[PDB]
Amino acid sequence: TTELPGRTSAYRIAEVRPQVSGIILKRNFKEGSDIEAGVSLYQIDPATYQATYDSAKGDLAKAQAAANIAQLTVNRYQKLLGTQYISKQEYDQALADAQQANAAVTAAKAAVETARINLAYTKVTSPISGRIGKSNVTEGALVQNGQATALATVQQLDPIYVDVTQSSNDMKAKVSLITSDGIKFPQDGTLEFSDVTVDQTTGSITLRAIFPNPDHTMMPGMFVRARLE
Amino acid sequence: TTELPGRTSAYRIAEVRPQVSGIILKRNFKEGSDIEAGVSLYQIDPATYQATYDSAKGDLAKAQAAANIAQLTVNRYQKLLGTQYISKQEYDQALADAQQANAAVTAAKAAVETARINLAYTKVTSPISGRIGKSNVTEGALVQNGQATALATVQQLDPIYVDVTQSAKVSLITSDGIKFPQDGTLEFSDVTVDQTTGSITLRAIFPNPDHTMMPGMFVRARL
């Protein structure tokens, strides 16, 4: 039974950004809709990346063949050491070829994994579940890894925050809202943590309430009346 | 049941971009016309891209044939393994050579794919169906994979959004005062809250079968 001015704000915010460059093949969400973490939001055309993957896998296959063939000649030569039929320089040379082929195998495995992860990142996702806004990018757009502007922003809409203020002069714990000049939000909130924010110049106490928002009806950035029991 | 002003925006927009560099051989659309997704909008000169592909496929066949020879050798070794003492060495050699011939195949298939994928891109298309605007590029222009400016922009019209500003069946009044023949729907689902201001925004949706409605035109919605 004491009401204060309040602002709603998001519990979690994440920007949707590409980790790989290319062309946006498709947008998978409606703007302003509820989204789940890890779901494909945009598909970057994966054709060229799929290829780099198939290529790198083919360099691996050649390299493993080359390594296997050289490994077999090391074994042949090893069992002929000490006999009329081979020399230590010959074996040492076969050893060198093997090592050389093995290094190639090494580097090729690296190339495959690199190109595998680029392929996977062609489906662009959000780290959190929430309400996605407008898309800042049209379909068929050129996106670059590391570009300034985010493609979209998602805001976690369930547990919602409400920042509340009282003056120095003003001075289990229920909080509730009058949504917009009358009607009351049918959810009850509590204070999030045993902590405050105090203003330096003017003596002031800002509190934070946390409300469940399962019907996804509260939005952040809303001016709201808040009362505390 | 009164009035709340709105403006129409496109349901979908797509930029048309080349994913392969070369010369624009032909433009296949008239500017301002209605287009279908996946139809060739521009043809980039495919000559070199074709040559690579045909060439790559030639390699694959050769590689494939060599694998046939190596596989046949391994089969013989296998079949004689139930009857004769065969050197593990002569056998691991046959296997090792089959592995090698197969790897050349795996390599050659990817060269076909790489070439196939570029060739496909000589036909430039839009991912969505819609109204195409002016072309940003003339015929015979040099286009580059990854260039900044898009070749053209296409806007989906047939279902159109109407956005309205605030402080279920929905119907329209066009700029002239006449009413729109098919009416739309408003969802409490989709919203937007302009925090830079604290303003509300609802998105309405209307069929536009006759393409008469255009994006960016000032509208008068009813409820």
Instruction: Identify the CATH class of A1-11+157-229.
Output: mainly beta
For residue B17, give how far its alpha carbon lies from the nearest alpha carbon of chain A (Å).
Answer: 7
CB contact under 8 A, A140 and B117: no
Quick one: which of B51, B56, B44, B52 has its CA closest to B20? B44
CATH 2.40.50.100 range(s) for chain B read: 12-46+121-156
Q: Is A91 exposed, middle or buried (0-12, 13-18, 19+ CB in 10 A)?
A: middle
Degrees (nearest 5) of the Cα angle A30, A32, A34?
80
| Of B134, B147, B156, nearest in space to B44 by CA | B147
Nearest to B214 by CA among B174, B170, B171, B165: B174
Torsion of CA B113, B115, B120, B124, to 10 degrees: 130
Burial annotation A40-57 (CB, 10 A radius, 16+ → b, else e): ebbbbbbbbbbbbbbbbb
In terms of CA atoms, which chain B residue is nearest residue A32?
B190
Chain A's closest residue to B167, CA to CA, is: A180
Residue whose token pair is 């060599």? B66
Q: In what order do the strands lie in the sheet with B152-156?
A: B12-16, B152-156, B130-132, B34-35
B126 and A140 in contact by Cβ < 8 A?
yes
Would you call B209 helix, strand, or coil by DSSP? coil
CB contacts of B109 in chain A (<8 Å) are 54, 58
Please give the structure tokens belonging to residue A98.
């093997």
The shortest CB-CB distance from B107 to any of A48, A62, A220 is to A62
Mark A177-199 as b/e (b = at least 16 C-beta within 10 Å). beeeeeeebeeebebbeeeeeee
What secondary structure, in 3-state letters, does B109-176 show? HHHHHHHHHHHHCCEECCCCCEEECCCCCCCCCEECCCCCCCCEEEEECCEEEEEEEECCEEEEECCC
- CB within 8 Å of chain B, chain A residues 138-197: 138-142
Query: How many Cβ atoms sit within 10 Å of the Cβ of residue B220?
Result: 18
Phi then psi for residue A155, to 5 deg, are -125, 125
A103 is written with which tokens? 């290094």
The most distant pair of C-alpha atoms in chain A lies apart, rounded to whole Å, by 104
Residue A70, CA distances (Å) to A64, A183, B60, B110, B218 in order: 10, 80, 25, 25, 75
Alpha-carbon distance B200 to B115, whole Å?
51
Q: Taking Cα atoms as reference points, which of B130, B147, B157, B144 lies closest to residue B34?
A: B130
Picking from B107, B14, B128, B121, the residue whose alpha carbon sits closest to that of residue B59 is B107
- Strand-by-strand arrangement of the B42-44 sheet: B123-124, B42-44, B22-27, B142-143
Which residues, including other chains, have CB under 8 Å from residue B139's CB and lie 6 or more apart? B24, B25, B26, B27
Taking the C-alpha atoms of residue B140 and residue A164, their distance in angstroms, rounded to an integer, is 63
Domain B47-120 belongs to what topology? Helix Hairpins (1.10.287)
SS (H, E, C) chain A: CCEEEEEEECCEEEEECCCCCEEEEEECCCCCCEECCCCCCEEECCHHHHHHHHHHHHHHHHHHHHHHHHHHHHHHHHCCCCCCCCCHHHHHHHHHHHHHHHHHHHHHHHHHHHHHHHHHCCEECCCCCEEECCCCCCECCEECCCCCCCCEEEEECCCEEEEEEEECCCCCCCEEEECCCCCECCCCEEECCCCCEECCCCCEEEEEEEECCCCCCCCCCCEEEEEEC
**B-chain residue closest to A75, CA distance:** B89
- Are A61 and B107 within 8 A, CB to CB? yes
A79 contacts chain B (CB < 8 A) = no
Asked whether A202 and A178 are in contact (CB, 8 A), the reply is: no
Residue of chain A with shortest Cα separation from B94? A69
What residues of B are in contact with residue A65 (Cβ under 8 Å)? 96, 99-100, 102-103
Q: Are A69 and B114 in contact (CB < 8 Å)?
A: no
Give CA separation, B48 vs B45, B116, B139, in Å: 8, 12, 19
DSSP-based three-state secondary structure for B59: helix
CATH number belonging to the domain at A12-46+121-156, selected among 2.60.40.10, 2.40.50.100, 3.30.2290.10, 3.40.50.800? 2.40.50.100
Q: What values do phi and psi take at B5, rounded to 5?
A: -65, 145
Angle subtended at Cα A224 by Cα A218 and Cα A171, rounded to the nearest 5 degrees: 130
* B47 half-sphere exposure, CB direction, 13 A CA radius: 5
Pair of tokens at residue B201: 């925004």
Query: Does any CB of chain B come closer than 8 Å to the CB of residue A25?
Result: yes
Residue B135 Cα, gap to closest chain A Cα (Å): 15
What is the residue whose two structure tokens read 């920042």? A163
Contacts of B199 (CB under 8 A, 6+ apart): B165, B166, B167, B193
> Which superfamily does CATH assign the domain made up of B1-11+157-223 to?
Efflux pump adaptor protein, beta barrel domain (2.40.30.170)
Q: How far apart are CA B143 and CA B23, in angstroms?
A: 6
By what method was this entry solved? X-ray
Residue A30 exposed, middle or buried by CB count within 10 Å (0-12, 13-18, 19+): middle
Maximum Cα–Cα distance across chain B = 97
